[PDB]
């Protein structure tokens, strides 16, 4: 029951991570967001966060993977 309004919200959230707009979230971009929240993750911790949702194993998160993750939390 994923609506177009929800996909638009999730795409906006994705864009907040995807700092350079290239369609993928990297550990560098994730680290930038975490440090702006006062967090202090290691590269290994960032790679762990990506791995949990990196469906195709290429080491970065694209929007299909991000949407899949948000849809799973909905159910």
């Amino acid at each position: 029951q994923l609506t177009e309004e929800q996909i638009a919200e999730f795409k906006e959230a994705f864009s907040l991570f995807d700092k350079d707009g290239d369609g993928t979230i990297t550990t560098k971009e994730l680290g930038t967001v975490m440090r702006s929240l006062g967090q202090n993750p290691t590269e290994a911790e960032l790679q762990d966060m990506i791995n949990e949702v990196d469906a195709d194993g290429n080491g970065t998160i694209d929007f299909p993977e991000f949407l899949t993750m948000m849809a799973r939390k909905m159910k």
Partner: peptide
């Protein structure tokens, strides 16, 4: 210990509300 979903709820609460 925070997941990508956890960080999304921090930086995009509307996405958060939809999930909950």
């Amino acid at each position: 210990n925070l997941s990508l979903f956890d960080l999304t709820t921090l930086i995009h609460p509307r996405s958060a509300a939809i999930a909950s």
